[PDB]
Amino acid sequence: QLNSTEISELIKQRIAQFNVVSEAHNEGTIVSVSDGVIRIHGLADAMQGEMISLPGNRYAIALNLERDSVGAVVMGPYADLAEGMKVKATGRILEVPVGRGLLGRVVNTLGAPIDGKGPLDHDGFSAVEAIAPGVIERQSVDQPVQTGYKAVDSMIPIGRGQRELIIGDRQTGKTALAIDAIINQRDSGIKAIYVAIGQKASTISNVVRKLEEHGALANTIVVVATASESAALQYLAPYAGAAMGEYFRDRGEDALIIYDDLSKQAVAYRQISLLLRRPPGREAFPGDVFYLHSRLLERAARVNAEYVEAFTKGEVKGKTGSLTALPIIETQAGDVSAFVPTNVISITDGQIFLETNLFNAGIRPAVNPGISVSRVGGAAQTKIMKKLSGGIRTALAQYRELAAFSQFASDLDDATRKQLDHGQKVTELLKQKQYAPMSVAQQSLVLFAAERGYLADVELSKIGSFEAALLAYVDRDHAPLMQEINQTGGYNDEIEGKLKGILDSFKATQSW
Amino acid sequence: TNVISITDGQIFLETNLFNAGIRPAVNPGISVSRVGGAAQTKIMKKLSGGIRTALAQYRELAAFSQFASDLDDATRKQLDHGQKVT
Amino acid sequence: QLNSTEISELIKQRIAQFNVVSEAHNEGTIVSVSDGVIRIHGLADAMQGEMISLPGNRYAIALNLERDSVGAVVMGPYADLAEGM
Amino acid sequence: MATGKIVQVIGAVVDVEFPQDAVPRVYDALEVQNGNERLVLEVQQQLGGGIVRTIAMGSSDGLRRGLDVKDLEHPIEVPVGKATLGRIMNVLGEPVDMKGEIGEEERWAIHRAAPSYEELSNSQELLETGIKVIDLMAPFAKGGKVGLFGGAGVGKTVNMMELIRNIAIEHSGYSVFAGVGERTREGNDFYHEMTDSNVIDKVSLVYGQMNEPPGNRLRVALTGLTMAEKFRDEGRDVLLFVDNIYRYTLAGTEVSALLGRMPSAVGYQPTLAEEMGVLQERITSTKTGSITSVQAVYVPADDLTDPSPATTFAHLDATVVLSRQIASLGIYPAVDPLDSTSRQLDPLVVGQEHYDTARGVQSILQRYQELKDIIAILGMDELSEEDKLVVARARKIQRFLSQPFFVAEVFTGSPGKYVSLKDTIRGFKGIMEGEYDHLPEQAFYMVGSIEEAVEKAKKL
Amino acid sequence: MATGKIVQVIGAVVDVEFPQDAVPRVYDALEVQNGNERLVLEVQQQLGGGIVRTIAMGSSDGLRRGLDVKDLEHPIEVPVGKATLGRIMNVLGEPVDMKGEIGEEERWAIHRAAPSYEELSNSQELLETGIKVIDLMAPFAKGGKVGLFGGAGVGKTVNMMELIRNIAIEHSGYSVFAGVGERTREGNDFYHEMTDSNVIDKVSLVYGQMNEPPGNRLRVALTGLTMAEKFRDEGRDVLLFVDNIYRYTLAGTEVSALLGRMPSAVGYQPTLAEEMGVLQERITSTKTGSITSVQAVYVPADDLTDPSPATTFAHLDATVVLSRQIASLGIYPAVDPLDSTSRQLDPLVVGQEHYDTARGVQSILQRYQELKDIIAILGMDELSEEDKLVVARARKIQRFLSQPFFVAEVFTGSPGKYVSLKDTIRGFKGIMEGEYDHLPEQAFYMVGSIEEAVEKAKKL
Amino acid sequence: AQAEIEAERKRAREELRKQVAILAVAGAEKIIERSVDEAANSDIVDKLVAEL
Amino acid sequence: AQAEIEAERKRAREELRKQVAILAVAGAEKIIERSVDEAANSDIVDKLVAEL
Amino acid sequence: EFITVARPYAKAAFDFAVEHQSVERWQDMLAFAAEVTKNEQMAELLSGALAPETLAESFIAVAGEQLDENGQNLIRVMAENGRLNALPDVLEQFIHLRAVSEATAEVDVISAAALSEQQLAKISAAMEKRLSRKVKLNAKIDKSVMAGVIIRAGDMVIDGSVRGRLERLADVL
C-alpha cells in the first residue's frame, strides 16, 4: 500500500492530460420534473437519442424533439434535479465499455462495475445503438450450440447464429433452461452474456452464485438492471448486452446472449412512452414496440469470414463470427395471443414452449414438443443426433395422436397399445435433472437405446435408473467411443455396431 | 369482492336453495362471521357448536350421496339429521 | 394547447380587415388533406350533406360543419389534392 | 414563513405556487393550516413556472384556493430506533396511541436507496413453521420473502397471524408490523393480543388503515420499511409483516390520474412496476443484517393474471397461493399446492427425501386434476382400476393438508396443532405409499400428525 | 435548393414546415442529410399551414431540428425492367448486394391506380407447378392468387422456394419476390439457394428487412408490385411472391399508431381493408399480360379469424393450408389434402378426369378418417375385405402425396423431383383403381412419379 | 480466496485515489481563490477570445 | 489478509498527505496556465492536515 | 404555457408590420396590449366564460393606444380563438422575429469583474465573426466565476471561466 506513490503519480498523469482549453457547447434549462422525465426548453441543436448531460455525472436520453421542448428520460435517480437547472448537449451517443476483460464481471447498463471487484480492463467503447449486418454479410447457420438437455438438443436444435425464444408462464423453468445453456458452454469456446431486465437483485446474486459454483462465471458477462433502477436503464440494458456480444461476433468468435424477460423491457418502454404522452396502442403499448424488439433481435447473426476480414482489417482470416440470442418471454395464463408474445413469436426463428401442466406432472424440463419448433432445424445438429432424433419425433407424434384414448386404454387393441406405451417410455426418457448437462455422446447413446427398442421391456418407473446405470457403465468400460463421438459427432455402420454391442452387453451384464 | 374485503363476514343467500323453498336460503360454507362466537349469548354458543360446518359437510355429502352411497348407515344418520335440521 | 386551423396567412388576412364579408359564401380553400379527408376553410353557406366540387371534376361530401371549417370526404383519388386549392 | 399559495384542489392532490427561485424539491414536505389544523403535503412533481403538485397526507376537505403554505425544507422523517418499539405510529411518525411523545434520538427520511448488489447476502437456513402445507410444498428461509396471494376472504390474514404466532414468539429479535390499508378492527385486536401477551415491547406497529385518505395508504409502507431498515442496519435480524401490499399500488392508482398520467393496461398507473420495485427492492437482507418478511398480497376479482399480482410474483421467494375453490370445501388453510412454490425447494437444500415427497404429492394432485373432467361427465365408475386408487389417494392428501390453527379456535373450537417437518414428510410418504390406504377420508380432515388420523378413524 | 425545415422528430415521425407556395403534395418524397448520410421522408398528411407530417424511410436517430429539407417533386420511384433481374434492392431501389449501380433504363412511381374493370380478361389457363398435391387438389389459373396458410415452421417459405425453382427452370417465366418484413437469415438462405440452383438470373429480389422502420416494411410490397407491373406491360406473364401479408398488415398498424389515428377492432388501423385492397387489386391479368401471385399468410394462434387473415380471404382464389401435425409425420410438402380448396376446382375448367380423380382422393381419405378410430379400438382384423383395401389405398395415396424438392435437397440430401400433371392424375387414378395394390406402402413415399414408385418397390 | 483478496486490494486502491483527488481539487481552488490577479484574469480573457 | 491490508491502508494514508499538496499546486498552475509562488501557505497546510 | 400558440399570431403580425414598414409602432402597441392583460381585474374577466366578441369589445374599450384598424383586428381574432392571455408571448416572439430579420443579436458577458473595454471590442468583433449579426453586449458580474468570463449568446455558450476549468478537471479525477 506504499503504492500511494503510484496513486499520486496516476493522479499526476490525469492532471497532466487535462487539455484545459475550452469548447463551445449548446445549452438549455429544465422546466419540469416528473416520474423520471424532464422537459428541457432550448437545445436547438439536440439530436434524437443524444445523451444530454445534467448536473452531477448524470445523463438523459433526448427522445422527443418537440417543436418547442425536448423530452428526456433521466438515466438514474432523478429526484435530485430541479426546475431551472442548466443542461448541456454533448455531441455524443450512448457508448458502453466492451471487450474481453468484461468476462466474469457484473456491470450495470452503463458498464459501471457493480460486483465491486474494482474497475474494468475493457478494450475500448462501442455504440449502444447499431445496425445489424446486411443480407450479403450473413452466412447460413450450420453449427450446433449444445444445451445439454435431451429434450432440446434432439427435437429443437439451436444453431450458432439462431434466435430461439423461450416462452412460458411464470415459474416453469425459463431461467433454469437458459442458465443451463450458459453453464454447458463453459468449455465450448462460446462466450456467454446474461442480461437481466427488472429482476430483484437477490435473484441476480443467487444466479451468479450458481454460476460461480459451477465453472461458468469465468466465461460470462452479467449485465444487470435491477427492478429499482429507472425505466431508461431497464429499457436500454438489452442493447448494452448486444453491444458487448458484437465485440466478439465482429472478431470471429462465437457468443451467446440471453435477454431475460424482454416482457419487462417492453413494460419499461411502455412506461416511458406514456409519460412522454405518445399515442397508446393495444394494451396501451406504444406502436413501435415491434420495431423495438425487431432491431434488437436482428443483431443476432452469423457473419461470413469476408465481413470479419473487412472489419478486423485483415487481422483475422477465415473465421466466421456469430451471436446467438435466447430471449425469454412470459405469458399470462398460457395466452400467446397478447401483444408482446405475438410480436416476438413473429420475429424469432423458433420457440421453446414451456408448459405448467407438464411441469406439474413431473416432466422437467417442461418443453412441449408438439408446438415447439425450430426453423434452422436439422441443419444445425450433429449428424449422429440428426440421424437418431427423427424417430423420436415420430414416436412422440404418434403418441400425441393416440393419447386421447389413455383414459379408455384398457379397451384398446395391443397393435396400438405397443405405440401408446412406447410414447410414454420415450417421454419418461426425456425428463432430466437440473444443472446436469449431458455431452452429445451421452444423449446420442441414450436416444439410440430407446430408438432401437431396448427399452421395450424395461418398466416405466425404472427408466431413469436404467439411464443412470447405462451412463456410468459406458463411462468406465467404453470411454474411447464416447471420446470419438463427442469429438466428431459422426455416424457409421461401424458406430452403430459398437453401440449395439454396448447395449447388448449392458442389458445382460449390468442391472438397474 | 371489493365489499367482501371490507366487512366482517357475509351472509350468502343462494338462489338454488331459495327456489327449493328453503327460506331463508342461507348457504353455509360460504357465509361466515369473522368475529365468530365471541358475539353470541353463552347458551346459543353452547348449543350451536360448529353446526355450520356440520351442514356444510352434509350439503357437500349430498353431492355424491344421491346416485349412490357408501358406509350406508353412518352416512345415513348423518344425512337424516342434516335433513331434519335444514 | 392545440391550434385550430388558424395560421399565419389567414390571420394576416383578418388583420387586413376583420369582417371579411367580401368573401363569397359559396367558395373556400382546402387547408388540410389526410387519409382521404379534407378540411375546407370558408364555404359559409355549405349545408350538411352537400356536394362540393373539387378541381379535376371530382366531388366531396360535406359531413362536419364546424365553427371554422368544413370536413369533407373525397369521392375518388385524393392523393393529388393539395392545401390551397 | 409561508411563501406559497394554493391554486387548485382536485380530490387528494393540491397544486401550490412558489416564487420562481424558491420552488421545493421533489418529495419535500410542505405544510398548510387547514383551518384549526395542520396538513402535510408531499410534493410529487415540479410543473413549470414555479408551480408544484402535491398529495395531501390528510383530509383534503376544507382547503380554499389562496391559502398560504409553508415549505419545510426536508422530506418526511419518522422516529426510529428502540424508542419506536411497542408503540403505534401514524404515517407521519406521530404517536397514535394515547401515550406520550416518542423519545427517539434520530429521525430518517422515508425515501431511501436500496442496498447495493455488492452488499446483499444469501442464506439457505430453513425456517420451520408449524404448518404442514407451507413447509412441505413451499419452505422458506430465514432472511427470505414470503407472500400470501389470495382473493377476498380466503385466509391470508389468519395465516399471517399463525405465522406470527409460530415464528415471532420463538424468535429473539425485534419485529415490525406495517398495517397498510386494511381493517382498523383487526389492528386493534392485534394490539390488544400483543399487549395481553406482554410481547408488545418487542413489536413496533405502524397503521395507515382503510379509513385514511389515499396519501396515508400510499406512504405508510415506506415508514414501516424505514423502521425495519433501521433495525437491520443496527445488525439485528428483524421480522417485517406487511398487512396488505396491494393497497399501496391501489392508492397509487387512485391518485395516478389526478397527477395527469395516461392510464395503462387495466386502468393502472403507468409506473406500476417501478412504484412496486422501488419499495420491494429495499426490503431485503444484507451482509450487515437480515430481514424476514411475510407480505399478504390481495388479488382482485380472484384473477391471478391481473397486472398487480403478476408483477408481484417476481419479487418474492416463496409464494403461497390461496384459492376460494379449496376454502369453500372447508379445507383450511386453503393453500393450493399446485401453485405454491419456493426458491428453497431443492434437493441441495431440503435433502432428497423432502424434495421427493413434495414432488410426489404434486404429481398425484396433478393427475387428479387431469381426471376431474371425465369424472364430472361420465362418473367415477368409468375410471381404470388404478385411477380409482389415484383418486382415492388424492382425496386423502387434500384433507391431510388441512390443519387446525391456534388462532382459529375462535371459529371452530377444535384446539390448534403444531406439526414438525420431520413428522409431516413421514405422514405424506406414508399416504402416497399406500400404507394408510384402509382408512376413510374424513379420518384425515383437520388433524395434526398421521397418528391423530389413525386415532380419529377408530371413533369414526 | 432545399426549401423546408424540420420542426419535430418523434420516433419515426418527422414534421416539416414549408412556405405556403411550395407545400409538397401527399406521398411526395422529401430528402434530408442525416449528417454524412442521405435520408428520404415520405409525406403522409398535409396539416395546418405549410406544415407536413412524414415518415422516415430510414433510421431516425441523429436528426436535429432545423435541418434543411429539399423536396423531390416525385413520389418514391424505383428502377424497372430487365436491369433489375438478379439484383437485390431495398424499398427505394438502391442496391444492397454490392454489385454496384443498377443500370436503370426507366423509373416508375410506386403509387398508381389499379386496372379498370374494363381492362381485365378472364382466362382459365391453369398453372403447372410440378407439386403433386398442389396441382391435383388446389389448381389455380393465370392472373389468380394463392394463399399458403399455416402456423410457424410448416413450410410456406420452402414451398415458395420450390415453386420459384420449378417455374423458372421448367417454364422460364420471370418472377418478382417481395420480402415484406424479411428475416435476414432466411433472405440470405434464399439468395444462396437461388444462386446455387442457377435460377437467380430470372428473378428480381426486393427486401424490406425486419430491422427497418415501419415505413420501409409497409411500402416494399408496392415496389415489388411496380416491378411486376413493368414486366406485365412488356406482355410477359410474371409471377409475384409476397413473403408475408401478415407483416404487411402489422407494418400498417404500426404506421397508423405512429400517425396517431384512432385504432379499430383489435388495434388494426382504420384503413385495413383499404390497404389490403390497394395492394391486392393491382395483381390482375389485364389483356396485355398477366401477374399471377402466391402469398404467404401466417395465422396467429390458429384462429383463422382475426382481421388480417380474415380480411385477406376475400381476395384469394385458392387456399392451401399446411398443418404441423402432418409435417411432424414427415409428409413434406405438408398441405392437408382435405382442407385446401380452390375456386378453379370444378369440372368445367379442370376436366372431368381431373375433377373425378380429386374427388376420389378426397373420398378415400375421408373414409380412412372414419376407419382409423375403429382400427384403434378393434384392431385391423374386424374390418371387411374392402375396408382393408380402402385403408391400404388411402395410406398409399397419403404417402404418394409426399415429394422431394430440389430446394429441400440441402435438408434431406435426396435429389428433388418434378412431376407433370398428366403423371399426377395417372398415378392417383391408377392407385385408386388398384393397379398398384401389389406394391408396399413405403414404395410410394417421396419417389416422385408413379413409375418411380414401381421401380422403388423392387429394391425394398 | 486469492481472487477475493486481489479484488479487495484494487477496491481499496481506487477509493483512496478518490480521497486524494477530492482534496487536491479543493486545494487548487483555494490557491486560485487567493492567486487571482487582474492581469492574469485579462490573459485568461485574451486566451478565450483568441480560442474563440 | 483483510487485517493486513488495513495496516497497509493507514500507512498509505500517511504518505498521501504530502503528495496532495503537490497535486493541488500542479492543478492550480495548469488551471491558471501559469506558475505561482503563492505566499499564504498557511491555508494549504491547514487543509493538508485537517481533513487527512 | 403559450409559446406554441403565440407563434402564428407573432409571425402574422410581423409580416404585416414589415409590409407596412411600421414594425417599430407595432412593437409598442403589442407591449401595451400585453400589460393590459396583467391587470388584476382584467385577468379575472379574461377567465370568465363570456362570448368572444363581448370580451373583445370590453378589451378594446381599455385601449386607445391601438391603431384603430389593425390592432383591433388582431385583438378580435385572438378573442375569437380565446387566446388573449397569449399576448405576453406574442410580444416576445415578435421581438425575436424582429431581431432575426434585422440581423442583430444580443450576447451576454458574465465576468468575475468589469472588463477593460478594448476587451469588449475584441469580444464583440470576434462574436461578429462567430455570428453574422450586429452584436450588442450586456455584461454582468458574478464572483462565482472567480476568474475569466462566460460568453452566453442565445443558447450557445463559451465557458472560459476558471470555475468551469476547475470542475471540468475535477470529473477526470
Ligand SMILES: Nc1ncnc2c1ncn2[C@@H]1O[C@H](COP(=O)(O)OP(=O)(O)OP(=O)(O)O)[C@@H](O)[C@H]1O
Ligand atoms: N429440470 C428441472 N428439474 C427439476 N426442477 C427444475 C428443473 N428446472 C427448473 N426446476 C425448478 O423450477 C423452479 C423454477 O425455476 P425457474 O426460476 O428457472 O423458472 P422461471 O420460469 O425462471 O421462474 P420465473 O419466471 O419466476 O423466473 C426452480 O426452483 C427450479 O428448481
Ligand SMILES: Nc1ncnc2c1ncn2[C@@H]1O[C@H](COP(=O)(O)OP(=O)(O)O)[C@@H](O)[C@H]1O
Ligand atoms: N384454520 C382455519 N380454520 C377455520 N377457519 C379458517 C381458518 N383459516 C381461515 N379461516 C376462515 O377464513 C375466513 C376469512 O378470514 P380472513 O383470513 O381474515 O380473510 P382475509 O384473508 O380476507 O383477511 C375467516 O372467517 C376464518 O373463519
Ligand SMILES: Nc1ncnc2c1ncn2[C@@H]1O[C@H](COP(=O)(O)OP(=O)(O)O)[C@@H](O)[C@H]1O
Ligand atoms: N419439403 C421439405 N423438406 C425438408 N425440410 C423441410 C420441408 N419443408 C419444410 N422443411 C423444414 O421446415 C423448417 C422451416 O422451413 P420454412 O420453409 O422456413 O417454414 P416456414 O417458412 O413455414 O416457417 C426447416 O427446418 C425446413 O428444413
Ligand SMILES: [Mg+2]
Ligand atoms: Mg427467472
Ligand SMILES: [Mg+2]
Ligand atoms: Mg383479508
Ligand SMILES: [Mg+2]
Ligand atoms: Mg415460415
